[PDB]
Amino acid sequence: AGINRTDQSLKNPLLGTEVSFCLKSSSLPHHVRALGQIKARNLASCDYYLLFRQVVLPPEVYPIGVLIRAAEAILTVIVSAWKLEHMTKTLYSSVRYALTNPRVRAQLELHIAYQRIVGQVSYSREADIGPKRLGNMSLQFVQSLVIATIDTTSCLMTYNHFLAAADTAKSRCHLLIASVVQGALWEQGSFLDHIINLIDTIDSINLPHDDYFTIIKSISPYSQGLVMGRHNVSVSSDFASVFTIPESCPQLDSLLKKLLQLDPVLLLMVSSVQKSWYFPEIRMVDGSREQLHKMRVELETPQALLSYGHTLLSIFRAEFIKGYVSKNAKWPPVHLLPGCDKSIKNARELGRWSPAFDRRWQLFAKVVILRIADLDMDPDFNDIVSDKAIISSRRDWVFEYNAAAFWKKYGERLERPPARSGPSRLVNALIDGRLDNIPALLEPFYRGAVEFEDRLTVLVPKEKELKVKGRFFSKQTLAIRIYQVVAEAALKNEVMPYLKTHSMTMSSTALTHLLNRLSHTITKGDSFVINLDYSSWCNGFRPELQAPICRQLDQMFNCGYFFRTGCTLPCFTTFIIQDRFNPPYSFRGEPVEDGVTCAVGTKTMGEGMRQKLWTILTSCWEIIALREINVTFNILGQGDNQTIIIHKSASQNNQLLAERALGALYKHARLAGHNLKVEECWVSDCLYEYGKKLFFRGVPVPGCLKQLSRVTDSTGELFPNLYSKLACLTSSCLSAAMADTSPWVALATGVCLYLIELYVELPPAIMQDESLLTTLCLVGPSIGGLPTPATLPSVFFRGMSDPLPFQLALLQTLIKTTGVTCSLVNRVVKLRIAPYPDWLSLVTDPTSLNIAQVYRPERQIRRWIEEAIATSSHSSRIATFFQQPLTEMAQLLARDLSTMMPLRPRDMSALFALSNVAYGLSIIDLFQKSSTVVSASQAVHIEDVALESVRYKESIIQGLLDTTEGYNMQPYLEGCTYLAAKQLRRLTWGRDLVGVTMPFVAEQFHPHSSVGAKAELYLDAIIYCPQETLRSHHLTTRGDQPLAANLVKDTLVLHQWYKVRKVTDPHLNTLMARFLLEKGYTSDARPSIQGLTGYVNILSTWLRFSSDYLHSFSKSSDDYTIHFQHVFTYGCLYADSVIRSGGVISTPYLLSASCKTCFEKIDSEEFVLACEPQYRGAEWLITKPVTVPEFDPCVSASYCLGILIGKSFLVDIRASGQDIMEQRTWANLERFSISDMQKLPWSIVIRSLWRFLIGARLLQFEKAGLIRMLYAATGPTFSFLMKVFQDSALLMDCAPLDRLSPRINFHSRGDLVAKLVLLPFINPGIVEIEVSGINSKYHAVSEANMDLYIAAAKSVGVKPTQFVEETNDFTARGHHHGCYSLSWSKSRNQSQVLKMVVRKLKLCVLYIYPTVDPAVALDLCHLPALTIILVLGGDPAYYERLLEMDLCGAVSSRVDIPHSLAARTHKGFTIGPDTGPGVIRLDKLESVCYAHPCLEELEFNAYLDSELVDISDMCCLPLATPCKALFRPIYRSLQSFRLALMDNYSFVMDLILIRGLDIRPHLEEFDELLVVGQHILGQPVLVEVVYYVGVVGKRPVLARHPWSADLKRITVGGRAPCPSAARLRDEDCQGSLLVGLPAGLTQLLIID
């Protein structure tokens, strides 16, 4: 007969009506066979967990030790392949402990016994399968009913009960292995004993069914209540007192309290599992009656409900108009009724939103919003085909029930028709063509009278939930489903982007910023969280609330009554409940109302219907409730669950504000008819939940136990097979690893579950061979094997990766370490090349090969389903779409794209994605692999899949047992895997493939420690520096260091990206023109447009990493094959493996470049498509055709970068203090290259920046913010401007700047940058000369194409050469010029004596410890013919600080960098240690005249090797042009300094008038420049000047003595003529400075 028991997992609710019908008066042939085989003691069907819990097997029945050894070998191979050999002992000991421990082994053997019974009985043609023994339990299967017996008690149940027991055992096996692996790799130790104690404590509950599942349902909110009760600091919590766990199960209470005592995070991890225990049997009578009561119960009157609906209409109008004014910069089409307020009229004419309409929303009862758009009454094929089952017509309600139940219950027959009167699925409605005319179907919803044959909804219970009375979803008629699709699409597209509360949730960036700000603020004491749960949300909504906003939405879209028909529709809709063996009565072919199984009309549509409107209504009443009490709030909505963030006010504390907020929310929830129970709501300052992720104190709680213990449905769209099981297991481990579970835990668990899944299905000949099992686990789908979790690089990385180099590296480690020869690898892989190239597999998966996939389950996919639908299609929308073969067009386009002369598969797939045939194949893919398309594809030949499963099983056993070898892979498993992968692709595809092979990062970089590293390792290495000694504390505590028609748009973006990098081909332009014609765009031209992985993110905040690989790969503009995110993730994984193995990080470490053939220079190469394309376009696949309305690059990019950096500084000064610490910019400035900045001319950029700042003409507060944040070291763009201006060649090449540099006096490099960027506000003097270089055409260059011009900017320019300046050299006898070395503010004599010592000792190399002051090292580096090798010990911070100070580049040329990073100890002649051989020391001499022709007086006498060597007889040699170490901005001539004296006097007097800026530090800069003045003034210099400053008559009068009483005293001290430049600059013809002097400058000259 037909196939029986067709499920292998629980996908249905547990019901016991059939068991009751079988025990009471059944006459069916198999019910008698079920009744005859029960015992005297028969338990009820709801007590199945009382019988399945007593099942015990004998110990150690399955010989699984070979699996243990194989798992250890697999993990050893993976860990040795990643070259992290210190985690090796940790991971296989967790696997060995898990499979040897008796309770986990017993659970695993129970799982194997259950799954072998499932494999033996499922998909069989035999109705009755005999005695199947499970330990002490004997099982008999009688079709859908199962009889289980241990000794003398029996339970007659359904097959879903047995699947629930098997899924319980499977979930517990997952839970125990995940618990062991998590306990081995985590700071708190093993927690397996609490898991076993939890299992025994729940298993020891001897209560009825309802109380048992009440405890299981309330086990999680009670534990969250305990965590909230002990760990709230600002609000009170009474959530723990609701639950009856302390009075029902005391042992469970003690266990949860001791888990609270050890670790609350462990309590939240353990308590979050809810499906590792059994599942309830739903009481259908009471739950059905309760639902049919709650859908028609009134808590509030209709008259109050309509008034509150009008109130919600007012705030809906207010928020919608606010959104439209914020986005479209104008009022929508509005109508002002009589009696409207005048502020509404004035704001309508002025086009503005006033900041007083938020609290006055009652004024918007007079503003009718007119038509803004039109309703789209043609849904696309994505939402039409999937996710729901339907009913064709109301004469098909008789096919959901049994006829024998209707005969026994009611005494008459059912009068069922023979045929089922139409389709039972959406896709069958497409093939039969009932969805050919959607507006003709939705016209009854427009007129307000839907037809009588469409008003039915079957309420179906949900599965795997802990409610004993059930939760029900809706199965509906096709017409109501199309109404739902159109209405939800209209609200999602046109209304909710204008509503701000939903729009911050829809945007990923705004939601991410909100969650980060919530994470930082709860720990400080603000922004407490209120959680609201609506238990009767979907049943509680009423028509009288929804009708006004539905009327407004119908007026907005020019659709009559379309949104208002759904509110009054439940009053006319027949509702029945799907319960076989309990059917409703039929009177004249229609159901009869009884209140339990049928209800003719309710007051709500149901669950999930009208989801978008109900969220808007809920947000509206919450905004009313919180705006009436003056709070700052943010609502995070998840439908029935609402999370509200309320910020602290200065006047009130959090508790009183929380009580007021709870009262307001309860009041305004009650008025809408949704009464919030006090037992279901809570407030917290430590716990909140969003996105199925639970956060405790702002840190996400681990979800390893919940995610790895989840049971998936598997075998999707196919017969049961091993490949789909391995695919869903691998996908589950990948999804867990992406959702913040540790990669090692998911990997080890996946290896264990992979071997158990093989042990279920494979014979003992395969499974007692260890080497075959290891090789079979390490082949993977990249080279044609089974899907394995071991071969995925996406577990540890987030971006796009290449599997093939990793796969070949794993096999090389397998052959070299494990005793498996290459012949066994040839045996397992069986590499079989295809005779002909199939280019469609390349354009779908660019990284794939042309090899045969023999283990893949075979549905023909490409042609059979197309032939079936083009033959059985009876109407339109299929004959039009499939009038030509899509696969032959796809292959023809693939052959057209295979004529690319450099064959780039990534660009080939990118051009294939912009074709209509790709969209057609996507629609066929949804016809094959989606939800509810499994029904048709499995129902066609429903019997044959049972034979196909056994055929696939015999084929895979015969394939795995076959001992013949395939293609020899020995050349591809030796040497570098990059070239091996490229040669394998060239062998298999026949042509060379460029641009798809990414090198494996563990072969490309190798980790070391700096304690034993040599000089040659530091040539190409990436350095990591920890700020502290790192332990397991820092893995969780954050540190100091920071972290449709759019295809036309995509086509033009790609067209611009091709054209800007100068690829030019007539055939490519023809092909993109054909794409533009098939998508309806007939216009000829349009030119329009750190961070890591999340598992190492917290530890990355304790590490400083940089790119010092520039000795061989980053010194040129040529790009190479390094993907840097993966390298930084790999280094942080090394750090994580050191910490989690019991080690510490106290020394800096490195990643050295090891494989030289993994570093390939990428060929930026034009691709020419040779042959003429034969594609010709389609034009029948897009149903909505879009309409046609719908200089050198260096200077343009210079002006655009200048205005972008200026507006970035503008949004930096408008940013708050919490925002400037973030690296967010206006137009994504961070992810730009550094080399193209060196190619770009920056003089044009500086003039564009200066002209944008003088064109802004900001107010005084913003200018004060500019000067304040640029004089300090704040702002991300200031760091960007430093990183740009790191090289001094860009400093010297700027032709304004070498003229400007005599004027400005800079204390540091950043001071010079700050003066350069904010000089035009304070000084227009050089602006009068270089304002003439303006060009208005370059100002008009748009910001949208700036990335395109940057992609043009990289190739044109060139980098400069850098120049080495000179300082004093001394040596031998000569003339004394001036002996100038650090005269600005530094101990110059310390440099003097060390230069004299190093020059008379004739040393060739000098070693400098980091205890030496940096400027002495700058002088010693600028000495020629000397090699300075510092002592870093792995820390590049001292050399970077040494390089930031200098302005020539002699520190970047005379320092040997690998020997500096490879130095730790004394190895030569040193300056820096206290006493030793070859150590230069400084001794203080109190009194010496220092009789030297060069220098006048000595302070420090230099001693060396416990001796003094006479440095008093040397002299100088001639000098050359100097660096900025001599500070030529203040040189001998005074007219540049008098211009500086003219400027700084003008600087302060303008900045006094600037509002919000108190001039203390800028006055200190003026004080230093006037100290340089006081060196030469000649009047007696007061050390302390009282220095009164004040403005009189809009003229700032500032001097020592107070000219007027309004002047303000500023205390300035420390003035002394300490530099020797005072004697130098004393010149002839005094009074020349008085010529052309301001009278105020004369007053500061002559002191008092």
Partner 1 sequence: TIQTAQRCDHSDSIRILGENIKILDRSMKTMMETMKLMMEKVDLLYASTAVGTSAPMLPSHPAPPR
> What does 296 interact with, of Zn ion, partner 1, none (CB < 5 to 8 A by kind)?
partner 1
- Asked if residue 1548 lies in contact with residue 1598, where contact means CB atoms within 8 angstroms, the answer is yes
Among 243-251, 448-456, 1237-1245, 1254-1262, the segment contacting partner 1 (CB under 8 A): 448-456
Q: Residues binding Zn ion: what is the number (CB under 5 A)? A: 8
SS3 410: helix
Q: Whose CA is closest to 496, among 576, 604, 612, 623?
A: 612
Shortest CB 584 distance to partner 1, Å: 15
Q: Is 1291 in the site for Zn ion (CB under 5 A)?
A: no
> What does 1155 interact with, of Zn ion, partner 1, none (CB < 5 to 8 A by kind)?
Zn ion
Q: Whose CA is closest to 455, among 569, 352, 315?
A: 569
SS3 744: helix
Q: Which of residues 289-308 bind partner 1 (CB under 8 A)?
A: 296, 302-303, 306
Q: Is 601 in the site for partner 1 (CB under 8 A)?
A: yes
Phi, psi at residue 129, to the nearest 5°? Answer: -100, 130
Shortest CB 1521 distance to Zn ion, Å: 11
- Asked if residue 1452 lies in contact with residue 1460, where contact means CB atoms within 8 angstroms, the answer is no
Q: Is 602 in the site for partner 1 (CB under 8 A)?
A: yes
CA 1071 and chain centroid, separation: 36
By CB under 8 A, name the one of 72, 109, 281, 544 that touches partner 1: 544
Q: Whose CA is closest to 780, among 744, 806, 748, 746?
A: 806
Cα distance between residue 463 and residue 1552, in whole Å: 74
Lookup result for tokens 């001394």: 1370
> What does 942 interact with, of Zn ion, partner 1, none (CB < 5 to 8 A by kind)?
none
Shortest CB 985 distance to Zn ion, Å: 16
Q: Is 486 in the site for partner 1 (CB under 8 A)?
A: no
Q: Is 1002 in the site for Zn ion (CB under 5 A)?
A: no
Shortest CB 1122 distance to Zn ion, Å: 13
Among 31-39, 447-455, 834-842, 1203-1211, the segment contacting partner 1 (CB under 8 A): 447-455
Cβ neighbors of 1062 (< 8 A, separation 6 or more) are 1166
Among 189-197, 568-576, 1026-1034, 1624-1632, the segment contacting partner 1 (CB under 8 A): 568-576
SS3 699: strand
Q: Which of residues 1433-1452 bind Zn ion (CB under 5 A)?
A: 1446-1448
> What does 1496 interact with, of Zn ion, partner 1, none (CB < 5 to 8 A by kind)?
none
Eight-state DSSP code of residue 1187: P
Distances (CA, A) of 306 to 309, 542, 672: 5, 10, 9
Q: Is 603 in the site for partner 1 (CB under 8 A)?
A: yes
Q: Is 1626 in the site for partner 1 (CB under 8 A)?
A: no
Q: Is 1287 in the site for Zn ion (CB under 5 A)?
A: no
User: Whose Cβ is closer to Zn ion: residue 1408's or residue 1447's?
Assistant: 1447
User: Whose Cβ is closer to partner 1: residue 374's or residue 962's?
Assistant: 374
Q: Is 976 in the site for Zn ion (CB under 5 A)?
A: yes
Cα distance between residue 272 and residue 1250, in whole Å: 59
User: Whose Cβ is closer to partner 1: residue 335's or residue 1375's?
Assistant: 335
**Burial class of residue 1241, CB neighbours in 10 A (0-12, 13-18, 19+):** middle
By CB under 8 A, name the one of 381, 399, 446, 1271 that touches partner 1: 446
Distances (CA, A) of 463 to 10, 317, 389: 8, 40, 16
Q: Is 439 in the site for partner 1 (CB under 8 A)?
A: yes
Q: Whose CA is closest to 1136, among 62, 82, 244, 69?
A: 82
Cα distance between residue 312 and residue 619, in whole Å: 10
Cα distance between residue 1638 and residue 1436, in whole Å: 50
Q: Whose CA is closest to 709, among 1140, 269, 113, 265?
A: 269
By CB under 8 A, name the one of 33, 217, 513, 551 that touches partner 1: 551
- Asked if residue 596 lies in contact with residue 283, where contact means CB atoms within 8 angstroms, the answer is no
User: Whose Cβ is closer to partner 1: residue 375's or residue 694's?
Assistant: 375
By CB under 8 A, name the one of 183, 221, 548, 785 that touches partner 1: 548
User: Whose Cβ is closer to partner 1: residue 342's or residue 1595's?
Assistant: 342
Shortest CB 318 distance to partner 1, Å: 18
User: Whose Cβ is closer to Zn ion: residue 157's or residue 1447's?
Assistant: 1447
Shortest CB 599 distance to partner 1, Å: 9
> What does 450 interact with, of Zn ion, partner 1, none (CB < 5 to 8 A by kind)?
partner 1
Cα distance between residue 1388 and residue 1371, in whole Å: 18
Q: Is 71 in the site for Zn ion (CB under 5 A)?
A: no
Buried b (16+ CB within 10 A) or exposed e, 1514-1534: bbbeeeeebbbbbbebbbeeb
Q: Is 1622 in the site for partner 1 (CB under 8 A)?
A: no
Q: Position 541: which residue type?
A: F
By CB under 8 A, name the one of 510, 571, 1334, 1488 that touches partner 1: 571
Shortest CB 568 distance to partner 1, Å: 4
Among 253-261, 544-552, 848-856, 938-946, the segment contacting partner 1 (CB under 8 A): 544-552
> What does 302 interact with, of partner 1, Zn ion, none (CB < 5 to 8 A by kind)?
partner 1
Tokens of 1431: 């002592």
Shortest CB 1391 distance to Zn ion, Å: 14
Among 192-200, 990-998, 1149-1157, 1192-1200, the segment contacting Zn ion (CB under 5 A): 1149-1157
Among 461-469, 731-739, 1157-1165, 1429-1437, the segment contacting Zn ion (CB under 5 A): 1157-1165
Binding track, positions 1478-1517, relative to Zn ion; x by CB under 5 A: ----------------------------------------
By CB under 5 A, name the one of 550, 683, 1523, 1563 that touches Zn ion: 1523
- β-pairing, 137-142 with 128-134? antiparallel
> What does 548 interact with, of partner 1, Zn ion, none (CB < 5 to 8 A by kind)?
partner 1
Q: Is 1007 in the site for partner 1 (CB under 8 A)?
A: no
Positive or negative: CA dihedral 841, 842, 846, 851: positive
- β-pairing, 1103-1105 with 472-477? unpaired
Tokens of 1274: 């704040």
Distances (CA, A) of 104 to 107, 203, 736, 749: 5, 16, 22, 13
Cα distance between residue 727 and residue 507, in whole Å: 32
Q: Position 477: which residue type?
A: T
Q: Is 1020 in the site for Zn ion (CB under 5 A)?
A: no
DSSP string, 587-625: SSSSB---SSSEEE--S---SSTTHHHHHHHHHHHHHHH
Among 52-60, 112-120, 679-687, 972-980, the segment contacting Zn ion (CB under 5 A): 972-980
Cα distance between residue 451 and residue 479, in whole Å: 10
Q: Whose CA is closest to 1183, among 438, 442, 497, 487?
A: 438
> What does 1446 interact with, of partner 1, Zn ion, none (CB < 5 to 8 A by kind)?
Zn ion
Q: Is 1155 in the site for Zn ion (CB under 5 A)?
A: yes
Shortest CB 486 distance to partner 1, Å: 14
Shortest CB 397 distance to partner 1, Å: 16
**Binding residues vs Zn ion (CB under 5 A):** 976, 1003, 1155, 1158, 1446-1448, 1523
Residues that bind partner 1 in the complex, under the rule CB under 8 A: 296, 302-303, 306, 335, 337-338, 368, 439, 443, 446-450, 452, 455, 543-544, 547-548, 551, 555, 560-561, 564-565, 567-569, 571-572, 593, 600-603
